[PDB]
Amino acid sequence: SLKLFLFEFATCGERIEDSTAVEGLAMFKSAFDGFKNYYEITGFVRPEFSCLFTLPVDSMDSMEKYLEKSDAFLIIAPEDDFLLYTLTKKAEKYCENLGSSSRAIAVTSDKWELYKKLRGEVQVPQTSLRPLDCKFIIKPRTACIGFSDEVPDGHIAQEFIEGINLSVSLAVGEDVKCLSVNEQIINNFRYAGAVVPARISDEVKREVVEEAVRAVECVEGLNGYVGVDIVYSDQPYVIEINARLTTPVVAFSRAYGASVADLLAGGEVKHVRRQMVRKSKSAEKPYVSVGDYTLEIIDLD
């Protein structure tokens, strides 16, 4: 009877804007329903979600008490302002980590540090702390974005790569295994949805997976589920590494007949039924809702 302390920031921590909260809630629900088949889940949720889970209501300020009684933990939280980093570093002092080490998260959380870590090992876009000569967009050094003539303090400048926006879900352990290749649908530099699996050719898939793997092998400490954001122009360009569960995971059960938990446990895909995950306002048939925001998972094609 292994106890898994499961925690997601929007669902169990501080209140965040509904737009982002709906994704966190979806991931927590998905993780809860998946890992509960392999561990006895321990943890708590915010009052607003007391009716959705068979867990007690509590404040994140009391998470130590839960960690002290757990055999493992999995923390899902935004990299923003080193939140994921600090939460993980705190948890590491108690039990086994099913996710990445705080050491690795400190690197992936800072895009400038990640750039220097990856540049000589895998293809990445030109990145700088000042304006670039090539078409570029600015983005916060730490954040889970847009055109600007200048680079404000705390931001990086990064070459804009035109092409297919994707993400690769990997299981990092003794070896690196590809769990899924997802297509990202972006609107105004913001992820509006994902298609699982990606609508790409097999060759493009192979290349994108090859480069995603190459990227994670660069960062010591990554472990468990890791997401890699990539843009395929004429080749794969690694844009970001999320050392934590990412939204596309919510579609795994419907798309593959296997949860991220099943996949991390060595289980294999049972079927392939392409799904579209999308963020919307007051959708009639959502997976989860937060305020007027809804996150849907629907069959595609």
UniProtKB/TrEMBL annotation:
GO terms for molecular function: ATP binding; metal ion binding. Residues 92-269 form the ATP-grasp domain. SUPFAM superfamilies: Glutathione synthetase ATP-binding domain-like. This is ATP-grasp domain-containing protein. It holds the Pfam family preATP-grasp_3. It comes from Archaeoglobus fulgidus (strain ATCC 49558 / DSM 4304 / JCM 9628 / NBRC 100126 / VC-16). The keyword Nucleotide-binding applies. Keywords: ATP-binding, Nucleotide-binding.
